[PDB]
Every structure is written in C-alpha cells, then in structure tokens.
Design a protein around this nucleic acid. Structure first.
Ligand SMILES: CC[C@H]1OC(=O)[C@H](C)[C@@H](O[C@H]2C[C@@](C)(OC)[C@@H](O)[C@H](C)O2)[C@H](C)[C@@H](O[C@@H]2O[C@H](C)C[C@H](N(C)C)[C@H]2O)[C@](C)(O)C[C@@H](C)C(=O)[C@H](C)[C@@H](O)[C@]1(C)O
Lengths: 118, 114, 54, 46
RNA sequence: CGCAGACCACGGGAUUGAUAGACCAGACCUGGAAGCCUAGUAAUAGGUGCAGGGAACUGGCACUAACCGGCCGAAAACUUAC
RNA sequence: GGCACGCGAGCUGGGUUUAGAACGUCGUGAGACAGUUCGGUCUCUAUCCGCCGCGCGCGUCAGAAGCUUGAGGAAACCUGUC
RNA sequence: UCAACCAUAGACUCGGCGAAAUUGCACUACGAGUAAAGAUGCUCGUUACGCGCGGCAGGACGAAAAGACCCCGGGACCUUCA
RNA sequence: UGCAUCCGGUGAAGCCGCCGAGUGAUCGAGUGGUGGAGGGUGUGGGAGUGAGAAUGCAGGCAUGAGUAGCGAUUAGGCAAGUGAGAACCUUGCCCGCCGAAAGACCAAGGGUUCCUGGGCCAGGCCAGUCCGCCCAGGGUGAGUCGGGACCUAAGGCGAGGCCG
RNA sequence: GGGGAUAAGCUCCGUGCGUCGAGAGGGAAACAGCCCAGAUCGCCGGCUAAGGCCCCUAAGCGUGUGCUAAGUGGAAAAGGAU
RNA sequence: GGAGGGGAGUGAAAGAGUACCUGAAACCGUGCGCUUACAAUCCGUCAGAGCCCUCGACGUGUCGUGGGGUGAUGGCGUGCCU
C-alpha cells in the first residue's frame, strides 16, 4: 500500500516489514489484538490486503500470501476459514477500536479486529 | 462557613511542582467531578492526589456524617517536603548533584448546599 | 553559553505558568446500568467493555 | 586504546612491599609502626 | 484526513457522507508470473498470455472508521443636534 | 572606502607568535636572529536585547460571519549583439 | 561549477526521572549625541499591545582560567676565563 | 562577673505582631500571639563584643528549568498468568543479533554476590510484582587436581665476619 | 614658558590663581576640573546670582530705533564676488 | 496495597506522635483587598485621582489637628565596596 510517509515503524525499513508480518500472523491466529495505535493504523492497509488474496483462493495466491506471513499453519486458516467467510463483503474486513493509554510511556493503544457481523 | 473534612498525604514521593500541575485542574470542582477528571488525566502525579481526595470524602462521609453528593473541593495545596540528595557522576571527573524531591498534599472538602 | 543574570521573580513565573495541562473532555456513558464518565475518544470501546472502569 | 590504570591490584606484592615483616625490618619502618600505634590506627600496617 | 504542518496553526469531511482505508476499473512502472503442456541428455527455450506483480494519479462503490457528546458563547447609561 | 584593517559563542589555520629538528650568521657557553626550512589540540546545552518564523490572552463599548479601503512598509530596478 | 533526493541517531511532540556552568539588580528597544574617549540603564527624539514555542548568532567589551606576549618584584634550572 | 535591689509556672528568655519613643547607634518595667525557666535595673571589673564584600568557611535553598540528558554501532511483537499497579516479571509462539563470540573452562582480582523462602519508602538514569539490591536460612567434601610437607634460578634475608 | 610641527584630552616647569581631588544645590540638553554659589534640621513664606521668559518649560508670540533674506542665527581657511 | 491521614484515647500540653524542646531567614504555596495587556521603568522618591480597612464626631452618609494598604498620572533620579 501507500508507504509510510514519515520515518519507519520499528526503527528501520527492514524491521517494519518484519513487524507488520508478525502482527498480521497474530491477528489472523487470534482474531483481535491490542497494539499501539500507529501500529494498528499501519496494519489495516496491509493485513486486509492479504484477505483479498485468500478471497480468490488459488495456488498462485497461496504462494503470494506465503511470501509474507511465513507461517504455514496460519495460511491454512486464512484460506479455509477467513477466506470464504469474507467472500461477499468487498473491503473493510477490519475495524479499529481505540482503548486506554499505556501506563508506562502513555502510548496510545488501539484494538484491531475482524468484522464478524455477517 | 460549611462543615468540612481534611486529608493529608505527607511525604509523597512526587515533586511538589509536579503535583501542582495536576491540582490546578481540580480546584473548586465537586468531589464526584474531581475523581472522574483525575482518573482520565494522563499524568502519573494524579494517583497520589486522587487517593487523598477520595480519603477526604471518606473522612467526611463516616467521621463526620455529611452526604457524599454535597461535597466540593474547597482548598487543595501541595507543599514541599524533605529532599534527599544523590550524586550523578559526569565527564572529566566532575560530580553533579541530583535532588530527590518529596511533597505533602492537603485537601479540604465542604458540604455546600446546592 | 550561560545565563548572564539571575532571572527575576516576575520573569520566572511568567514563563513557568505556561507549563500546564488541559483537562480532558468527558462524556457520560452507561455501562451495566451505572453512569460513568469517559472521554469521547473512548466512547465506543467502553460500550463493548474494552475499557476497564475502576 | 590503552586504558591501563595505575593500580593493578595484587596481594603477594602488597604484603611484600608494604607488609608488616618488611616494616619491622628496618629502623625507619619500626618508627612507622610505632607512630601509627600512637595515633590509634586500627590497621598498623598494610 | 490534506500537496497544510516542528507543536500550535491553516484547509476539507463528519451518515442529509466520497474525508481516509479497503474493493472494482482505468492510467502508469516493470517486462512475459505460478501451474501445465511441448522440444532438448542438460543448462534452457516455445505455447497457454500485453501474462503477472504493483504504492502515491483518475473514476465508481458506504464495506470499515468519522460516534446514542462535551465545553465556551449576546447590551450601565448620559449630553447636545436633527 | 567605512562597518573592532565588518564578520572565528558562524567555518578553515596556510601565515604569524610555545614546546621538536636543521642550515647560514653572532656568542668561548647556556643560547639568539622583524633570516630560512619540515611538523605542531580552534572549547561552550542561548538567560537578555537583536533578528527570522508560529501561536495563547485581551482590546477595538452587545455576540458573531463574509468581503474590503488602505495610512505605513517590504521586493524589484542590470544589460549586450545583430 | 551548483546543488538535489532517500533512511537512520538527535533535534521537534506526549508520559516518567531530572542535572550544569553563570548569576549585584530588573515590567533589560533603536538613532544622534554625552560620559573612564565602543551606553538596555544618561540627554533629546523615533518606534514599540501582555505571555509564550522553534530557529540564527550581531551585542551584553558573553562563559572558562587573579594574561603564558610586555614591564616591575621574587624564584627555579642551565652556562661560563662572574 | 563584685555588690544592692526588683520581676518570674498567676508564665522568664527567645521568636512573630500592634501602638508608639529618642538628635544616632537604638528603646518600650507599653501591650497581643507562640513559648516553658530563668531575667531587669544602679554602680564598678573584664571582653573570643557589632560583617556586605577577603574569586572568604560550613549548612540550607534559589536562577538556568520542569530545560539537557537517560550511556552505541542487534529489534522487538503477540496470547495467557500473577498482581492493587505490568512495554520492562513469568510461560508459550514468532522475529532478530553474536557464533576465533556477545559460546564453554581457568589464573590474578573480588568476598557470600551462589541456592531456597521472603520484601518492594533506600538503589536501578523511568515504573517494576524483578534484580548482582535488603532480610533470614542453606551451600564449598580430594592419597591422585593448583600449592605446602620435595628441589632450585633472578632476588631477598643472612650465624660468624669484614668495612664504617 | 621650555620640548613638539609654536599638534595633541601630550609632556615638564612658575602663580597668597581657581575648582575637582575631598563638594552637594542652579546653569551649560546629557557632561569631576567651565559659570553662579559652600548643604546644622524643618516650613505648601519672601528677594536674588549665573541662566532665561512662543509650546515642551518656570517667567515677555515686552517697548523704541534700526540691520539680515542667508534658516545667517543654529560650525571653518587662503581667496572669489555689481 | 502500603506510606500517610480522620475520628476515638494517653497526656497539663499531640501549636510534645519516636520525621518528636523552643522553631527565625532564604525558598515554596494557598485565600483575601488594591493595581496592571498603547507601554521605555538602578525599580525609588515628592506631589497625587480612585478603591478597600480602621478611630472619632455629626444620620440614612458626611467631615477630621485623623491612622493604614494599594497605588492611575506628573516632576526628579547613572547600583554597594575596593
Ligand atoms: C578541548 C577542551 C579545551 O578546549 C580548548 O582546547 C580550547 C580551544 C582552548 O584554546 C586553545 C587553542 C587556541 C587555538 O585558542 C583557540 C590557542 O590560541 C590557545 C592555546 O587556546 C581554551 C579556550 C584556552 O583558552 C584560550 O586561552 C588563551 C590563552 C586566551 C584565549 N582568548 C580568550 C584570548 C582563550 O580562548 C584555555 C586557557 O586552555 C581554557 C582553559 C580554561 C582550559 O584549560 C579548559 C578547561 C580546556 O580544557 C578546554 C576549554 O576544555
């Protein structure tokens, strides 16, 4: 998606890419995660473009997803449950809910989910 | 003059001027409003202050038998308490002092009829 | 360079009082049947229970 | 870099050049011990 | 949210909505994907196929988020002339 | 031409003017030379005035919103060949 | 010549802990002068609503070290047919 | 401090005020508050007897200022737990860094830091339920390992001795 | 009076010369050394000195007779000039 | 959670609570009265409008051989010691 305009997220370009993949893996495995708000904002244009790949389930797309998330177990979950579940809804697979600030460094916190409504 | 209750927190491990930054938000408000503002304030100095104001109402509630809902925060002020000195080493041998500060806090709540 | 003079009382307090905090704007929400005040930013979460109210 | 400080501690060398049995050996050393006793020192010698 | 920006400010939108993200389509960049089949001993080449991948530009689309919300905010009169 | 022969809390250190070394010359000697030659640490978180920018408060006799006149400033002003 | 763009560590914003050199004062403008002969503080004028935030370093003869150059006084060490 | 006198738990000294006084250093046996045990006056005697400054000494506290910093070149993330309190503690799964080291064993050095239980005003450049921190208890097993009981080098001491 | 270039806010001398030093008050815009005048204290009384009397600024856009056209007044030389 | 505190008690006194006699100054707050956002201020001094408090006499508030606190505005005014 649109690259981060500002300076990167983990402190480097390489660390951001590993940060996004790990968060997306956690998000799909559990369903909802609670992270720092600027992390959750950067997750949406990334974690929900993968669901687009799982929507058009094919061998080619499975190679595309596996080249980012690196975890073979989650890909099956993505292509067998998350994939066909969102087969009708176009866009907006995730929702971001804002929560309390962290006690230690007062970082803003946000909870990113998957829409389970339909 | 209205009936009132007092609370003190002596030797609170917070800098006196860093407790005044939060107290200023809460002068003259009622205790119910005081606690709600203090909880959502993003300053770590709010925890000792909220405990005192909660304690002042508790003294008024039980030791004096005033209604909780009629209490307002009349006078609040954070004095300064004993200071212990530490030393932080620096470059080229010089040793600069470090002051560990401490503060007292006083709260008085009165039962002003609405 | 170093301060040449000892800043007077009027000049110290004038600048110091600009170091203050702004109290948050709180709205009233009803959780479990009781009314509690949460900032409008955290309004949506407090209805779903994601916000812990002491 | 060369950060070798002056004091490199050692115990045989300490008691061999500031020790008691060296102090009592010479005339000046016995004065050092007898002097520190008068001042009341707890540790007469190194 | 912004091509506005050190913070602040400034400009736009806030369900009577195209403000951002996504989704579809287009422009453009790269250059002929994976899988399969065929030829070759093999490196590799050809077909399927202007294919595939893709961020910023353009247009549709309320699918997600702009919220069952708080705080400020309006008049002593008098004299002379007409 | 002036502005500390403008300007080193803005930059360099080639020169000059520390300690090393050599030549010519002076001195019996330590040494010396407005003689020459090779080498030789450039420190500091901006308090006040100043200046470049951006905000918060109040005022302009009720509270607000558009669109403006402009006293007073600032910028520019070069020029050749055919 | 002649600079341009990208990323990190600072700078900048929010939360926590929290120093230092300096310091006679203080609601510390500018011009022409006057003065111990280079004035925020004096005379005569001109300009300037109160308080801040990020920046630049011209002044406060800015900070640091009771000038190492020069001279007077006292040492120290060296030289020699003192 | 001599001597003589008067006040004081019915409240002295000291400290903070009000109302005043003297030509000055200053005064108040004029009075309020705090205080709790010694003071005043006259006349003599003796002074460690009066500080605003010595880049004076010791203690306390300001201005700069809620400002600079928070100590590399690796990088953290999520779920669950304990807890009043969790970015920093524990468990699991991912990611990353060293890999002639940032792994393993020693000598010198340190001296209880090692383990178990407990604690979270002091310290940790933040908070901490954690800790090389604080408290209590426990732990170091040699005929063969490194040493002595075996041996000498450089060197030290040195019966007598020589020299002074 | 010497030295100097008959320059210095220069330097060295003389002076029953002054003042500052060691001296306030009025005047010279400000301005130790020039001019008036030596502060024992108080007064919400009076007369004057140097200096002034259009407004700032106290008291005269004072009276008589003239002169100046240059803002001379409110800086200057050899020399030029119906 | 603790620290700490509020009632209740001991005590002559808790303005004696193991941070403990008396408890000053620098330094730090809180409440009240006056004043301050067109203004050049060795931070005072001499005049001085307004507001607030007090003591008297006289009516509703108005003067006085009055006392205090603030001070708008004008005049004057170049730190202390060596
Ligand atoms: C690194 C750290 C040092 O920085 C330097 O090296 C600077 C660069 C020196 O300049 C060196 C380098 C240089 C070239 O000057 C820049 C040379 O001229 C001399 C030797 O000074 C300084 C500031 C010197 O000042 C100079 O002293 C001169 C005699 C007078 C000059 N000026 C005021 C008249 C003044 O600046 C002086 C005395 O050493 C300062 C004293 C107090 C110190 O010793 C301090 C503690 C030094 O440790 C230092 C400052 O930390």
């Amino acid at each position: 998606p649109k690259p981060t305009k500002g300076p990167r997220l983990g402190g480097s370009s390489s660390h951001q890419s590993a940060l996004l993949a790990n968060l997306a893996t956690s998000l799909f495995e559990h369903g909802r995660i609670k992270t720092t708000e600027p992390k959750a904002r950067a997750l949406r244009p990334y974690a929900e473009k993968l669901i687009t790949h799982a929507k058009k389930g094919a061998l080619h797309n499975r190679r595309e997803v596996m080249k980012k998330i690196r975890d073979k177990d989650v890909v099956h979950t993505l292509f067998a449950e998350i994939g066909p579940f969102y087969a009708d809804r176009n866009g907006g697979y995730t929702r971001i809910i804002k929560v309390e600030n962290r006690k230690g460094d007062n970082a803003p916190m946000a909870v990113i989910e998957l829409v389970r409504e339909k | 003059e209205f009936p009132s209750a007092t609370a003190k927190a002596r030797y609170v491990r917070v800098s006196a001027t860093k407790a005044r930054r939060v107290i200023d938000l809460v002068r003259g408000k009622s205790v119910e409003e005081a606690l709600d503002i203090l909880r959502w304030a993003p300053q770590a100095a709010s925890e000792p202050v909220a405990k005192v104001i909660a304690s002042a109402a508790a003294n008024a509630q039980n030791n004096e038998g005033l209604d909780p809902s009629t209490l307002v925060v009349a006078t609040v002020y954070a004095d300064e308490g004993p200071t212990a000195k530490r030393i932080r080493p620096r470059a080229q041998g010089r040793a600069f002092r470090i002051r560990k500060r401490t503060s007292h806090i006083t709260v008085i709540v009165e039962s002003r009829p609405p | 360079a170093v301060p040449k003079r000892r800043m007077s009382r009027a000049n110290t307090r004038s600048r110091r009082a600009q170091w203050k905090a702004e109290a948050p704007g709180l709205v009233t929400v009803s959780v479990a049947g009781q009314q509690r005040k949460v900032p409008r930013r955290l309004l949506k979460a407090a209805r779903l229970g994601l916000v812990d109210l002491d | 870099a060369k950060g070798k400080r002056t004091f490199q501690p050692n115990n045989r060398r300490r008691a061999r050049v500031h020790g008691f049995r060296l102090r009592m050996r010479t005339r000046a050393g016995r004065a050092i011990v007898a002097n520190r006793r008068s001042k009341g020192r707890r540790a007469l010698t190194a």
